[PDB]
Amino acid sequence: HMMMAQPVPYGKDTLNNSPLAADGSDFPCKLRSNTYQVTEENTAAIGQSMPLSFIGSAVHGGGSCQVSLTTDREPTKDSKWIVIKSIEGGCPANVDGNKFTYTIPEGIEPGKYTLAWTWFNRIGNREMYMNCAPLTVTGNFPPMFVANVNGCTTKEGVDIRFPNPGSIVEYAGDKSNLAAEGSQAC
Ligand SMILES: [Cl-]
Ligand SMILES: [Zn+2]
């Protein structure tokens, strides 16, 4: 189980490392008392490299992640999300024990957004992790992939390839675990 530490999520004080509820009842962003409370506003310039980091008790052999944006500062199940980065394999890490960035690309207008990190764990229960953060962008993108909370279930043991990964894709896992190009993810 993991949670995002950078960028700083909304409602950090009540954010836990549990995945989204399987029935979709807390999608998006782990709906709770203070889901969209700004703990710390995160700020990024277009083209600026920004840190993405995580804390928790198990990386579940990694998996695959997206970084997505919505103009909604209080997203609902009907919000439109656009992917700015996909990481296929090796996210959030490969092993447990005692690395990633994203950039706001050209084509994103300055303004206020919600940023989401989503993670599909390679090993264990068929889960979707999601944490959301307030992002201010100072001054070609596909819809975010959703599975495991919507009746679409992924396959255990594989680093999934997103159907629509977008043009910014990093591979950080073991090639032997990476799903085939064009494979059905769920
Ligand atoms: Cl860990
Ligand atoms: Zn876990």
Residue 98 contacts by C-beta under 8 Å, 6 or more apart in sequence? none
**Which pair of tokens denotes residue 6?**
């950078």
**Structural contact between residues 116 and 81, judged by C-beta atoms closer than 8 angstroms:** yes
Rounded distance between C-alpha atoms, residue 82 and residue 105, angstroms: 12
**Which pair of tokens denotes residue 52?**
């993405």
Rounded distance between C-alpha atoms, residue 23 and residue 161, angstroms: 23
Residue 135 contacts by C-beta under 8 Å, 6 or more apart in sequence? 7, 41, 42, 43, 44, 69, 104, 112, 113, 114, 115
**Which pair of tokens denotes residue 156?**
């255990």
Residue 176 contacts by C-beta under 8 Å, 6 or more apart in sequence? none
> What DSSP element (H or E) covers 171?
strand 169-171
Which residues have a beta carbon within 5 Å of ligand 2, which is an ion?
A: 1, 58
**Structural contact between residues 110 and 137, judged by C-beta atoms closer than 8 angstroms:** yes
Tell me the β-bridge partners of 115.
Answer: 69, 133
**Structural contact between residues 114 and 70, judged by C-beta atoms closer than 8 angstroms:** yes
Q: Please report how many Cα atoms fall inside a 13 Å half-sphere around the Cα of residue 9, on the Cβ side.
A: 26
Which residues have a beta carbon within 5 Å of ligand 1, which is an ion?
A: 96
Rounded distance between C-alpha atoms, residue 98 and residue 37, angstroms: 31
- Counting ligands in written order, which one lies closest to the CA of residue 119? 2
- Structural resolution in Å: 1.5
Rounded distance between C-alpha atoms, residue 4 and residue 118, angstroms: 10
Rounded distance between C-alpha atoms, residue 116 and residue 174, angstroms: 25
Output b/e per residue, 34-54; b: 16+ Cβ within 10 A: ebbeebeebebeeeeebebeb
Residue 181 contacts by C-beta under 8 Å, 6 or more apart in sequence? 161
Pairing between β-strand 100-103 and β-strand 82-88 as defined by DSSP bridges: unpaired
CATH number at residue 144: 2.70.50.70
Q: How far is the CA of 183 from the centre of ligand 2 (A)?
A: 25
Per-residue 3-state assignment (H helix, E strand, C coil) for 49-102: EEEEEEEECCCCCCEEEEEEEECCCCCCCCCCCEEEEEEECCCCCCCCCCCEEE
The identity of residue 122, as a single letter, is: R
- The Cα-based distances of 175 to 143, 159, 160, 171 in angstroms read 25, 9, 11, 9
- Structural domain including 62 reads 1-186
| Cα torsion 84, 52, 23, 165: sign | positive
74 among annotated binding-site residues: yes
- Counting ligands in written order, which one lies closest to the CA of residue 18? 2
**Domain count along the chain:** 1
1 among annotated binding-site residues: yes
DSSP readout, 102-160?
EE--TTPPSEEEEEEEEEEESSSS---EEEEEEEEE---PPBPP--SSSS--PPTTSBP
Location of structure tokens 């889901």: 35
